[PDB]
Amino acid sequence: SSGIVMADWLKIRGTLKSWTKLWCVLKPGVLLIYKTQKNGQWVGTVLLNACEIIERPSKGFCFKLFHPLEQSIWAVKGPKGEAVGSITQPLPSSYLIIRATSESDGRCWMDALELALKSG
């Protein structure tokens, strides 16, 4: 009933190239990012509807979510009404660079992300 298409750890490159491991959940039209896997501290929600996706060779496997018009990709409000995201390494306003453990995992995420873009 959840509507959760995918959930797994992904590494997200900050502006500070710290590659933090964060818990990521995919629901139609949104990617929800958390510090921890269960009942986690919300960091941000990416509005996939405003986004396009491109592959980024080469290390594992990296892909980039970006706003084609260089605008903000981020939800104003948390899934639970949260005003502000949990503090993390600084992240870009208009794009996100993401890494997955395996090529197969990465391709799955990416394909799933593609469908998710125009739904919700």
Residue numbers in the entry: 6 to 64, 67 to 127
In the authors' words:
To understand the structural principles of ER–PM tethering by ORP5/8, the structure of the ORP8 PH domain was determined by X-ray crystallography. A distinctive feature that stands out, however, is the presence of an unusually long 25 amino acid stretch forming an extended β6–β7 loop (His209–Ser236). Comparative analysis of electrostatic surface of ORP8 PH domain with Osh3p PH domain reveals a distinct positively charged cavity, representing a putative PtdInsP-binding region. The analogous surface on the Osh3p PH domain has a neutral charge suggesting that ORP5 and ORP8 PH domains may possess a distinct PtdInsP-binding mechanism. Close inspection of the distinct positively charged cavity of ORP8 PH domain shows the amino acids forming the basic patch are lined on the β1–β2 and β5–β6 loops (non-canonical mode). Structure-based sequence alignments of related PH domain containing LTPs ORP5, ORP8, OSBP, Cert, and Osh3p establish that the putative PtdInsP residues (red inverted triangles) in ORP5 and ORP8 PH domain are not conserved in OSBP, Cert, and Osh3p. Notably the side chains (green triangles) mediating canonical PtdIns(4)P interaction with OSBP, Cert, and Osh3p are missing in ORP5 and ORP8. To confirm the importance of the non-canonical basic surface for PtdInsP binding, we designed point mutations R136Q, R179Q, and R158Q, R201Q in the ORP5 and ORP8 PH domains, respectively. Both the point mutations in ORP5 and ORP8 PH domains completely abolished the binding to PtdInsPs, confirming that ORP5 and ORP8 PH domain follows a non-canonical PtdInsP-binding regime. While most PH domains (including Osh3, OSBP) utilize the canonical PtdInsP-binding regime for PM targeting, the PH domain of ORP5/8 possesses an atypical PtdInsP-binding site that does not permit PtdIns(4)P binding.
